[PDB]
Each structure stands twice: as C-alpha cells, then as structure tokens.
Amino acid sequence: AAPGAPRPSNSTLVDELESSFEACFASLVSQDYVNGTDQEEIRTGVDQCIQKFLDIARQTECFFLQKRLQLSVQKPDQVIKEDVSELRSELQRKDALVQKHLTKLRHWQQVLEDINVQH
Amino acid sequence: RNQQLRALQEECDRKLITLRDEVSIDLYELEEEYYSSSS
Amino acid sequence: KAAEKPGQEDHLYVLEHNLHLLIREFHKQTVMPHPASAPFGH
Amino acid sequence: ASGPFGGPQAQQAAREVNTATLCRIGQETVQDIVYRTMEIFQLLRNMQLPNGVTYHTGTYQDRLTKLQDHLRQLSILFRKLRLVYDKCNENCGGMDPIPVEQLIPYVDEDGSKERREIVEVNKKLKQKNQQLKQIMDQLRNLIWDINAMLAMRN
C-alpha cells in the first residue's frame, strides 16, 4: 500500500534486472493481434521502462561499489594483488606494442634499403 | 634523364610520406600507450 | 694530410630548407609569361 | 563454484581469492550488459524493409542472423550476472555489517582528537615508464620529418 510505513517485499536486486529487461519489450514481444492504429501512446511506457531499468542499474552499481569498498577496507591484500596484476598486464601490453613497432620499423627499413634504383 | 630521376625522387618522396603514414600510425599506436603509465 | 661539435638537434633537416629556398626564389623569378599572346609579363 | 563460465575477462582468474577482481568483473559485466542493450537497440533501429528495391533477399537475411548472435551474447551475460552475484554474497569473511556511516569518519582526515610487493611493483612500473618515455623521445622528435620540408614534399 502507499500510505503504509512497512515495506512488505523481498527477493530483489538479482531477478529484478531480468524482470525489468524482459517485461518492457512486451510492446514488441507479444503473441497477440496488434491494432494497426497507435501513436504517442506506446512512448510513455518505454520511457518508464528505461527509467526503471537505469534506476535499478544504478542501484546495482552502488551495491557493487559498496561491496568493493567494504572488502578493500577489510582485505587490502586482494586489492594490492589486483593492482599488481594490472600493472604486470599493462607492462606486458606496452612491451608487446614496443616489439610490434620495432618489427614494423625493421620491415620498413629492410624493404627500402635499396630504394635508390641506380647511379 | 631528368624526367627519369624525377621518378627517382617522386616515388621516393611518396615513400617518405608512406613512411610518415606508417610512423604516424606508430605515433598514434604509442600515444594511447603513453596514457597507461600511471607514474 | 672534442665535445662541443655535437649539440642539440640542429642538423640536416633544417638547412636543406634554407638551401632549397634559394633555387625556389630563382624559379619564382626566373615559367613562360603567355598572358594572352605576348605582352611578356608576370 | 564461481569460476570461468564463459566470461570475457582479460587476465582475471576468478578464484577463491581476489574478491575485488570479482566485484570489478561484475560491475564491468553489468556495464557491458547495459551497453549491449543500447547497441542492440541501435542495431534494430534501422531495420529497413526486407523487400528492398535492388536487394531481394541478400543483405538483411544475413544481418538479422548476426543480430541473433548479439542476442546470444547478452544472454550469457545474464548467466554471468548470476555467477558473480552468488560469489558477492558468498565471501562473507570479516566484519559482515561494516557500517559505511561509521566508515565516513574513518576516511576523514581527523576529528581534532606487507607493502613490499606493492612498492616493488610500483618501482618496476616507474622504471618501465621511464624507459618507455626514453624510447618515445626519439620517434617523438623525428615524428614530423616532413613539416619543415613541405616546401618540396609533393
């Protein structure tokens, strides 16, 4: 109910996403005849469903960020190892790009070593 | 002969531009790479 | 029949422009006039 | 348990440790899910009439099929959405309540009242950036190579 203080509901934040995503396609996905006359009516519904979808999305985002903050202030070693692995991957990618550029320059100089025809 | 050596430089010039092109790509290929370093 | 000769990057790919500028100024004030028939101008 | 059930991860291992990586992968997954929703909407936007003037049944017949793949894609993302969601609720180790309200004073400066590997990796990355910039400088300066010489370049 609207004026009631207690919130009698549960089991959300997981099934809610799939529910919202599937449900507001109903205008499209439906095994029912479609009356070939409608305008400026189906709009408000899809606006509302994108609204609720981004809302629950933001909710999930905030929940994930709060969990990450709690685990970081709880287990900093995990975040340290994560940052270490990320830095290792970044260094590996940088080295790979450097090697690619080196091979490219090598090929480029090798092909036109004798660019001059004759003298 | 002049015309001949014209080609000798002309394509060469193009080659240089091609080099630049490749270099430019390489240039760009490193610029984003410069972003990654969080020093 | 020391360590001052080498300096900052001020090498071949500057002076070539200065050199080419001379022959370019020659060329620019050397093309046939051909304005309409033969007033012989610029 | 929570493992590699077909998630487009780069280097993450998704093991009993590094719950930070798990939370970050889940956040990335939901972000990519929203992005895929927007993308598939953009694709279905210009769903031109199948009965094309020139093309009879050639082009679109392929495109729609490709769209199906996209659908499949977002499909498995939903699966991943569950796989992480359990793990997020699984690793309940250490200070389960964790009041953020109390944590806000803690992240403040004051109230008027282990890192060896980290430092090693930091120094390694700093030296890597140094040698990277050293390698940069040369091609960076020689990059133009035609700018001063456009007077005769073509």
Curated annotation (Swiss-Prot), chain A:
A GO term, aspect molecular function: actin binding
Entry keyword annotation includes Transcription regulation: yes
Keywords: Actin-binding, Activator, Coiled coil, Cytoplasm, Membrane, Nucleus, Transcription, Transcription regulation
Sections of the chain in a coiled coil: 78-114
Domain of life from the UniProt record: Eukaryota
UniProt subcellular location: Nucleus; Cytoplasm; Membrane
Biological process (GO), any one: somatic stem cell population maintenance
Statement: the UniProt record of this protein carries the keyword Ubl conjugation: no
Cellular component terms per the entry's GO annotation: core mediator complex; cortical actin cytoskeleton; cytoskeleton; mediator complex; membrane; nucleoplasm; nucleus
Function per UniProt: Component of the Mediator complex, a coactivator involved in the regulated transcription of nearly all RNA polymerase II-dependent genes. Mediator functions as a bridge to convey information from gene-specific regulatory proteins to the basal RNA polymerase II transcription machinery. Mediator is recruited to promoters by direct interactions with regulatory proteins and serves as a scaffold for the assembly of a functional preinitiation complex with RNA polymerase II and the general transcription factors.
Family: Belongs to the Mediator complex subunit 28 family.
Protein name according to UniProt: Mediator of RNA polymerase II transcription subunit 28
Organismal lineage: Eukaryota, Metazoa, Chordata, Craniata, Vertebrata
Full-length numbering of the shown residues: 32 to 150 of 178
Swiss-Prot record, chain B:
Coiled-coil intervals: 1-22
Subunit structure: Component of the Mediator complex, which is composed of MED1, MED4, MED6, MED7, MED8, MED9, MED10, MED11, MED12, MED13, MED13L, MED14, MED15, MED16, MED17, MED18, MED19, MED20, MED21, MED22, MED23, MED24, MED25, MED26, MED27, MED29, MED30, MED31, CCNC, CDK8 and CDC2L6/CDK11. The MED12, MED13, CCNC and CDK8 subunits form a distinct module termed the CDK8 module. Mediator containing the CDK8 module is less active than Mediator lacking this module in supporting transcriptional activation.
Domain of life: Eukaryota
Protein family: Belongs to the Mediator complex subunit 22 family.
Summary of the function given for this chain in its UniProt record: Component of the Mediator complex, a coactivator involved in the regulated transcription of nearly all RNA polymerase II-dependent genes. Mediator functions as a bridge to convey information from gene-specific regulatory proteins to the basal RNA polymerase II transcription machinery. Mediator is recruited to promoters by direct interactions with regulatory proteins and serves as a scaffold for the assembly of a functional preinitiation complex with RNA polymerase II and the general transcription factors.
Localization (cell): Nucleus
Protein name: Mediator of RNA polymerase II transcription subunit 22
Swiss-Prot record, chain C:
Location within or outside the cell: Nucleus
Protein name: Mediator of RNA polymerase II transcription subunit 17
Function: Component of the Mediator complex, a coactivator involved in the regulated transcription of nearly all RNA polymerase II-dependent genes. Mediator functions as a bridge to convey information from gene-specific regulatory proteins to the basal RNA polymerase II transcription machinery. Mediator is recruited to promoters by direct interactions with regulatory proteins and serves as a scaffold for the assembly of a functional preinitiation complex with RNA polymerase II and the general transcription factors.
Lineage: Eukaryota, Metazoa, Chordata, Craniata, Vertebrata
Family assignment from sequence similarity: Belongs to the Mediator complex subunit 17 family.
Subunit record text: Component of the Mediator complex, which is composed of MED1, MED4, MED6, MED7, MED8, MED9, MED10, MED11, MED12, MED13, MED13L, MED14, MED15, MED16, MED17, MED18, MED19, MED20, MED21, MED22, MED23, MED24, MED25, MED26, MED27, MED29, MED30, MED31, CCNC, CDK8 and CDC2L6/CDK11. The MED12, MED13, CCNC and CDK8 subunits form a distinct module termed the CDK8 module. Mediator containing the CDK8 module is less active than Mediator lacking this module in supporting transcriptional activation.
Gene it is expressed from: Med17
Swiss-Prot record, chain D:
InterPro entries reported for this sequence: Mediator_Med30_met (IPR021019)
Keywords per UniProt: Acetylation, Activator, Coiled coil, Nucleus, Transcription, Transcription regulation
Coiled coil: 114-149
Molecular function via GO: nuclear thyroid hormone receptor binding; transcription coactivator activity; ubiquitin protein ligase activity
Disulfide bridges in this chain: none
Protein's GO biological process: positive regulation of transcription elongation by RNA polymerase II; positive regulation of transcription initiation by RNA polymerase II; protein ubiquitination; RNA polymerase II preinitiation complex assembly; somatic stem cell population maintenance
Entry's localization field: Nucleus
GO cellular component: core mediator complex; mediator complex; nucleoplasm; nucleus; ubiquitin ligase complex
Subunit-structure text: Component of the Mediator complex, which is composed of MED1, MED4, MED6, MED7, MED8, MED9, MED10, MED11, MED12, MED13, MED13L, MED14, MED15, MED16, MED17, MED18, MED19, MED20, MED21, MED22, MED23, MED24, MED25, MED26, MED27, MED29, MED30, MED31, CCNC, CDK8 and CDC2L6/CDK11. The MED12, MED13, CCNC and CDK8 subunits form a distinct module termed the CDK8 module. Mediator containing the CDK8 module is less active than Mediator lacking this module in supporting transcriptional activation.
Similarity comment text for this entry: Belongs to the Mediator complex subunit 30 family.
Protein name: Mediator of RNA polymerase II transcription subunit 30
Organism: Mus musculus (Mouse)
